[PDB]
Amino acid sequence: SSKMDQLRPVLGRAGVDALWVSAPANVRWLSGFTSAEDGKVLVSPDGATLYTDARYTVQAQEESSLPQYIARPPATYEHAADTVRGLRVGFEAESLTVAELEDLRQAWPNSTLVALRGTLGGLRAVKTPEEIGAIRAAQDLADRVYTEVRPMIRAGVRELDVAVEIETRLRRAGGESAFELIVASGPNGAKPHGHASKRVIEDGDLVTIDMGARLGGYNSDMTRTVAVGTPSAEMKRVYDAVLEAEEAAIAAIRPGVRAADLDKLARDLLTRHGLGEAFHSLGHGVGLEVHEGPGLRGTSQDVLEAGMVITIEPGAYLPGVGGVRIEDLILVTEDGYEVLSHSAKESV
Amino acid sequence: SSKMDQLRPVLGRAGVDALWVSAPANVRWLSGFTSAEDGKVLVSPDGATLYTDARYTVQAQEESSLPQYIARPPATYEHAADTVRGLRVGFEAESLTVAELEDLRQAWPNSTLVALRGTLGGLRAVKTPEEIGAIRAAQDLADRVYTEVRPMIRAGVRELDVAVEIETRLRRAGGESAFELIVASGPNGAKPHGHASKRVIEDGDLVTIDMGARLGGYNSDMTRTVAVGTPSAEMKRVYDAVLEAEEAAIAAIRPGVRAADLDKLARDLLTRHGLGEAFHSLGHGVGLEVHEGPGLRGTSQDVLEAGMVITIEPGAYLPGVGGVRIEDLILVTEDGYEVLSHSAKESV
Numbered sequence A, B: 001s002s003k004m005d006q007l008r009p010v011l012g013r014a015g016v017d018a019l020w021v022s023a024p025a026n027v028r029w030l031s032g033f034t035s036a037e038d039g040k041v042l043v044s045p046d047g048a049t050l051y052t053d054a055r056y057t058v059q060a061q062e063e064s065s066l067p068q069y070i071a072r073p074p075a076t077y078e079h080a081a082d083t084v085r086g087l088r089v090g091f092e093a094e095s096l097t098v099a100e101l102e103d104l105r106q107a108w109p110n111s112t113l114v115a116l117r118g119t120l121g122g123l124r125a126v127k128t129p130e131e132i133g134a135i136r137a138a139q140d141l142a143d144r145v146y147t148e149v150r151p152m153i154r155a156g157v158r159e160l161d162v163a164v165e166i167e168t169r170l171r172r173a174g175g176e177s178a179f180e181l182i183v184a185s186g187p188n189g190a191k192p193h194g195h196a197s198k199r200v201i202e203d204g205d206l207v208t209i210d211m212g213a214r215l216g217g218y219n220s221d222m223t224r225t226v227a228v229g230t231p232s233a234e235m236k237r238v239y240d241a242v243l244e245a246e247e248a249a250i251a252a253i254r255p256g257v258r259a260a261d262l263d264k265l266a267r268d269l270l271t272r273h274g275l276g277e278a279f280h281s282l283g284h285g286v287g288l289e290v291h292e293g294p295g296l297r298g299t300s301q302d303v304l305e306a307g308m309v310i311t312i313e314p315g316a317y318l319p320g321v322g323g324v325r326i327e328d329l330i331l332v333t334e335d336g337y338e339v340l341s342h343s344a345k346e347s348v
């Protein structure tokens, strides 16, 4: 199935005739345009057009699989107006600002603007072989940088300096850090989104490193926890249980498995090991964004299929004491899975 | 004048009784909360309240000058509903997503939601002595890092590696790069927003370095152009004219000067030196955001006053050949100006 043929049935079930595409990830997904913050796409009964300005004329001609209309707003959607006369036009209500919607409403007085909220969640969940290649390249960069920086994670080093070393190397390679880096040591490990602080790593700490590369527009995401010196018996028990949970959830990945059931497997296991209040979401899709569909929460209705790329990231957090998360990036295959993130997972 | 007493007359002239504050910069400006992406503020006839969730209970108690209501959405604006019954409630239409507006409309069925578009532009233009202190600290960091990295800007070095060296040092100091770094060498100097590429700097190039630090939530912004070796006679003429324009526009800064008239001074001067098609905006306010009010375009109606912090950044760009921009960060004083960015401006 082409990407447009994935989208149009969704729009039909949403009760709209057209879609104004404003989320940069979906502009790029549909058209191939890589400066998508400055493009928009109109999907309509007449076909699909990329709108961008004359700074991008050559780039858009080289990249876009869609015909182009070159202008700045508001000429872009005034030119579009004829195409959407009398139509129900969906828009991405979680992306579009009210001011932008007002502009469209003024431009399209004979259309009905229809808010789509979660409607396109998971639109991009199944990746093509080309997209998987770009995700592999990003994760391979992240693994290389993690391997290079790992020896530097020792007593006396600040969390922040570890983060600087990772960022430095990702940038020099032509990528960048995919999200604000987490290097969470000692009691900072109890913070699931504890961005690298000035705390000095000390003997006896666990250190949680959550990192990804964005490279060529595609993202990776992994987490490792390592010991500096000898951790407490309690923190070793926590680490072992989190690793056990991660390995069990990964081992259930296959087409047709329910995301919510993966979450249940991990929470039952953590509960069995005394951490039934310590762990939230088990993971998320990764692609043009770090966090995208599917979602691995207990309430999720998502169902995995081959070609999706997700994370599995159980964690347990003891406030004031410590915490552990271990996370891998997984490709769903036709009869199981492939782990894309290859950095070592150590004993503690 | 307190910040709230700057805001309320604006709201009165906008025809609203209250304001739902969603832009992180304005949440922080009004309340002092530093994790403002996860706070919101309701300004109303009853006073003003910061809304944030229980992850931030202690932080918000320590930081906020405003009473707090602790909950997640949608409890936050359902709790707010009683306060806005029968009122015209403004919201920030350039910040708020349509989905967020729909949520407010459902929560506040007996209020009238009123879109404010450019209404709050320049709300934060006049800085307090405390805010000026934070901007000085950010620019002082940027100047230190620029001085450290300057010798590394030589033939054989990639644009990207210069950017990495700046970023590395800003991060290790506890700040970060304020915006995607521009290191634009040779023909890349014709690109006003040419992010640092893999191009190798060579003898005979000019190199334009546009950088800022974000530190403690406040931003800086400057640009220097330097010669590596001997530039062409033409590129030297361009450099000298841009410096002349920057120094003339800066010298006109004072309370009461019109932003548009500063722009005219710079464009007339560039025109007199043969660059009347080569140069756009002359500059912008800087504070909690890199680009904020006032605006120094030919159409601007802004009028400078003491305590504003702006940039002056004339440039001339020759596609396929080269380009020059020179930019300084300026405090408006009671009878003139003070240049906050102190890095050397060199001859070429």
Ligand SMILES: [Zn+2]
Pocket (backbone or CB within 6 Å): A221, A283, A284, A311, A313, A327
């Ligand atoms: Zn993740």
Ligand SMILES: [Zn+2]
Pocket (backbone or CB within 6 Å): A210, A211, A221, A222, A223, A313, A327
């Ligand atoms: Zn992660």
Ligand SMILES: [Zn+2]
Pocket (backbone or CB within 6 Å): B221, B283, B284, B311, B313, B327
């Ligand atoms: Zn600037």
Ligand SMILES: [Zn+2]
Pocket (backbone or CB within 6 Å): B210, B211, B221, B222, B223, B313, B327
């Ligand atoms: Zn600048």
